[PDB]
Amino acid sequence: GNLTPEERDARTVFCMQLAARIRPRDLEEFFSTVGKVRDVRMISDRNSRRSKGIAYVEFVDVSSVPLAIGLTGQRVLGVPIIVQASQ
């Protein structure tokens, strides 16, 4: 049941340029179209004056990572998201 940290990294994307008001629910919903989401972790202490929030989104399968990266530029709460491999 336990994945190693490296195995979890292989399933995780790092997200940038998140709207100040973003919620984990918003990321769960957005990424659900490319795979099953296991965990969402907001890293940013919200700067309300900037659309530069960050988060990790961990999927169940490694297959979802390239698909999620491909969503880069799509508008989440009106702001183009940047999605990169965690590792």
User: Within 13 Å, how many C-alpha atoms sit on residue 33's CB side?
Assistant: 9
Q: In angstroms, what is the resolution?
A: 1.3
How many whole angstroms separate alpha carbon 20 and alpha carbon 12?
A: 21
User: What kind of experiment solved this structure?
Assistant: X-ray
- In the CATH scheme, what is the homologous superfamily, with its name and number, of domain 4-87? RRM (RNA recognition motif) domain (3.30.70.330)
Q: Tell me the one-letter amino acid at 39.
A: D
How many whole angstroms separate alpha carbon 86 and alpha carbon 79?
A: 21
Query: Are 34 and 49 in contact, with CB atoms under 8 Å apart?
Result: no
Query: Are 55 and 44 in contact, with CB atoms under 8 Å apart?
Result: yes
